[PDB]
Each structure stands twice: as C-alpha cells, then as structure tokens.
Amino acid sequence: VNLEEACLERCFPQTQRRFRYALFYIGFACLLWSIYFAVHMRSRLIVMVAPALCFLLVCVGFFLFTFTKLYARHYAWTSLALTLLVFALTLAAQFQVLLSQVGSFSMCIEVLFLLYTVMHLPLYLSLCLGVAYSVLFETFGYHFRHWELLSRGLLHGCIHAIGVHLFVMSQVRSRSTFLKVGQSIMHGKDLEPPINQFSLNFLDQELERSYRTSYQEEVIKNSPVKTFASPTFSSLLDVFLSTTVFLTLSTTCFLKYEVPPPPAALAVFSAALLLEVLSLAVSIRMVFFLEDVMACTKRLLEWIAGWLPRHCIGAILVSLPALAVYSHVTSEYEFPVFTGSAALIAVVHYCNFCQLSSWMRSSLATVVGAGPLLLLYVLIGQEVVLVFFLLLLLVWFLNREFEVSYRLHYHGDVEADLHRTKIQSM
C-alpha cells in the first residue's frame, strides 16, 4: 500500500485539474438552465431559477476549497460532497417541475458521467451511488408526474455500462503509467506531456508514425495480452460494450411498436447484427489466437489493424447504436420522447472506442447523434438544442481527456522499453 499512497500524490494534480473542470461544467450548465427557465417558464420562476443560482455559489465555495490544504489531503471527501449536492439539485429539479423527459434525462446522464469519470471515488461507492441516484430519478418522475417501465431501465443500464467502462479503463491508464514512469526512474538510476493541446498529437512526427502503427505492429508481432491497457484487448472491450449498447438500445425501440416497424427498421438492425457478430469474433482472433487461426485470416487481421482501416470500422461500429434510433423515423412521426431520450444514449456511446481519434468520434456524435434529431425539429424546439449542446460538450471533453490519457500511456510504454534496452546494452 506504500506505492498506492505515492501513486495518488503523482495522480493528485490530475484528480484536481479534472475535479475543477467538473465545477466549471456544472456552473456553466446551471447558468444556462436558469436563463432557459427564467424566460420560457416564468409561471414558476423563483421556485426553479433560485436553486440554479444558489447552487452556483456552491461551485464557487468548492473551487476555492481546492487551493486549501484540506483538499490537498481530503480531495476524495470534497468530491463526495459534489456527488451528493448535485444529486439533490437534479432529483429536486425532476420533482419541482411537476419540462420534457428529455431535459431531465440529460441531467441524469450528465451528472452520472461526472461521478463515474471525473469525481475520483471508489468503484463500489461510485457505482452504488449512481444506481441509487438513477433509481431515485426514475421513481420521482413517475410518482410525481408493463413494457414502458422496462425501457427506462434499459436506457439507465446503458449509462452505467458506459460510465463503468470509462471509469475502469481510466484507472488502468493512470496506474499503468505510474508503474512504467517509475520503472524508468530506477532504470536511469541503474544506468549511471508531449501532446499538443489542439490536435491531441505528439509533437514529434516520429512518435506519431509509430503510434499510428502501434496496433498493427502489435498484431504483426503477436505480442501476448498482458493487461487491460494492451492495444488489442482494449478493442475487445470496446466492441463488447458497443454490441451491448446497441442491443439494449435496440430492445427499447422495438418495445415501442408493441403500425408495424418500417422495412428500413428491420433492415438496419439485422445489417448491424450481421456486421456486429463478425466484429466481436474478429477481436477474439486478435487476442486469443485459437488453433483455428490460419495464414489467410492472419493476412487480413493486420490490415484491419492499421490506422485508416480501423477508423472506418470503428466509425460505423460506434455509430451502429445511433443508426438503430433513426431507423424508426418515418413520415408518421406526428415517438417524440422515445426517440429523443434514446438519442442521448447514442451520443453518449461515442465516448467508447478510446483508441480511435477523439476529434472524429466527437464530431461524429454531433452529426450522427445530434444532427438528425436537431434537423427533424426544423419550448420543445428551443430545449432540444440546449439539452444536446450540454451533453455534446461533455462528450467532447471526456473524449479529449481519455485520449490524452491513452496516448500518454503509450508514451510511457515506449519510454520504459527504451530505458530497458539501454540497460541491457550496458
């Protein structure tokens, strides 16, 4: 446990810079809602706007608490108080209004994401608080408003599955980087952030070229699966979550029809499933390497492992759950709540596939997860914009934060084995 305590100190600047960004997020989010509430809901203004601006004072008090010595020692406890206080604000917002179900569901999604990824609490405390908050969210709305109740749970389960996967995989990067960065320290002893802010790339073009081929050389060399941070194992968990996110999301949409589903609706789902079953099986052949492996399928396995080809597969794999939502849209739309609330999971799902470029993933969430619903409306109309804009920027920030936490792990891997080679030389 001695190295555990030193690990936290090394990661303390990260758990503080992240936490201070969450305060900016909720402070900005709670200010846009107050402006939206103070104009379109003047019938009950002081009873809903006042919590928004009053809680803005909580962020100010918490932001200054960061510089206090107590935060340098009790950063976990202060992060817990955000989890409880923001829960109270969002749970009461659902109760106080009775606003669209889409607007409330965005609050549940965004607050859940902050707890899982950018709050730094123990897994059992984070997961239990998230489910307890979600079960309180889905129970206050119906109480203070067969198959209809199951659909909300399936969407709720998808949020936790993505959040847990982001949380678990983020601790893997931080811990593995800490071990490998400290591994080089003893190597340099025995011998005697290189990422641009805008494009999220290593400044040295030489590091880019090897990084872009990292998956390919991993497959070509058939290196064994070591930990959860291996480039080929991360793909397996990414596809496995993508299949489950797609399947649970597809189950709810087909529960709405229970007018028969459009021929397109049956076509896209089955086309996705036919593509999906191969993708899950291909990743098996890339990590497990059964005796059924053979030369011809080893030729194609490395080709898919390249930068351009894997981006194409990941782009349609990440967008596969989103394409299930928009395959149910026809001229008989006038459905306005189920499509909107399911689409929030679609844009959220773009946080998965951390290996791919964040800029392409985040952009595709805007055009393939937000654009269709936004244009379908072209005040409910003035709320879907603000609901999606808040969630999109959270997706953009989280994808950015995990991409720099994945390439940094690779930079620690190449730096660790460079020192190891130098040690073997002498």
Residues 6 or more apart whose CB falls under 8 angstroms from that of 101 comprise 141, 337, 340, 341
* Nearest one of 25, 23, 52 to 36, comparing CA atoms: 52
| Residue for token pair 């390497």 | 289
Contacts 24+ apart (CB under 8 A), 101-106: 101/141, 101/337, 101/340, 101/341, 102/337, 102/340, 102/341, 102/344, 102/383, 102/384, 102/387, 103/383, 103/387, 104/137, 104/141, 105/155, 105/341, 105/344, 106/344, 106/387, 106/388, 106/390, 106/391
Q: How many CA atoms lie within 13 A of 136 on its CB side?
A: 18
CA distance readout (Å), 416 to 2, 45, 78, 175, 188: 22, 58, 35, 14, 10
**Residue 195 backbone phi and psi in degrees, to 5:** -130, 130
Q: Which of 177, 75, 226 is nearest to 407 (CA)?
A: 177
* Token pair belonging to 236: 């397996």
Method underlying the structure = cryo-EM
CA pair distance 163, 169, nearest whole angstrom: 10
Place of tokens 């996110």: 245
Cα distance between residue 270 and residue 353, in whole Å: 22
Q: Count Cα atoms within 13 angstroms, Cβ side, for 9.
A: 5
Q: What is the distance between the alpha carbons of residues 57 and 63, in angstroms, rounded to a whole number? A: 10
Question: Can you tell me the distance from the alpha carbon of 21 to that of 27, in angstroms, rounded to the nearest whole number?
Answer: 10
Whole-number Å distance between alpha carbons of 38 and 304? 52
Find tokens 């793909």 and name the residue. 235
Cα–Cα distance, 397 to 181 (Å, whole number): 25
Please give the backbone phi and psi of residue 8, each rounded to the nearest 5 degrees, phi first: -65, -40
Helix axis angle, 147-191 to 338-349, nearest 10°: 10
Q: What is the 3-state secondary structure (H, E, C) of the chain?
A: CHHHHHHHHHHHHHHHHHHHHHHHHHHHHHHHHHHHHHHHCHHHCHHHHHHHHHHHHHHHHHHHHHHCHHHHHHHHHHHHHHHHHHHHHHHHHHHHHCCCHHHHHHHHHHHHHHHHHCCCCCHHHHHHHHHHHHHHHHHHHHHCCCHHHHHHHHHHHHHHHHHHHHHHHHHHHHHHHHHHHHHHHHHHHHHCCCECCCCCCECCHHHHHHHHCHHHHHHHHCCCCCCCCCHHHHHHHHHHHHHHHHHHHHHHHHHHCCCCCCHHHHHHHHHHHHHHHHHHHHHHHHHCCCCCCCHHHHHHHHHHCCHHHHHHHHHHHHCHHHHHHHHHCCCCCCCCCHHHHHHHHHHHHCCCCCCCCHHHHHHHHHHHHHHHHHHHCCCHHHHHHHHHHHHHHHHHHHHHHHHHHHHHHHHHHHHHHHHHHHHHHC
**What residues contact 206, with CB distance under 8 A and at least 6 apart?**
none
Phi, psi for residue 202 in degrees, rounded to 5: -65, 135
Query: Which among 241, 77, 83, 66 is positioned nearest to 168, based on CA atoms?
Result: 241
Q: What is the CA radius of gyration of the chain?
A: 23
Q: Tokens 């030729």 appear where?
A: 299
Vertex 209, ends 420 and 311: CA angle to 5°? Answer: 120
| Structural contact between residues 350 and 361, judged by C-beta atoms closer than 8 angstroms | yes
Residue 101 near residue 141, CB atoms below 8 Å: yes
Distance CA 103, CA 125 (A): 26
Resolution of the PDB structure in angstroms = 3.2
Yes or no: say if 322 and 369 are a contact pair by the CB < 8 Å rule.
yes
Rounded to whole angstroms, the Cα distance separating 236 from 281 reads 9
Residue 203 neighbours by CB under 8 Å, 6+ apart: 194, 195, 196
Least Cα distance to 27 among 99, 106, 89 occurs for 89
Residues in the chain after which the chain is broken, C→N over 2.5 Å: 98, 145, 192, 258, 334, 378
Contacts 24+ apart (CB under 8 A), 38-41: 40/379, 40/382, 40/383, 41/99
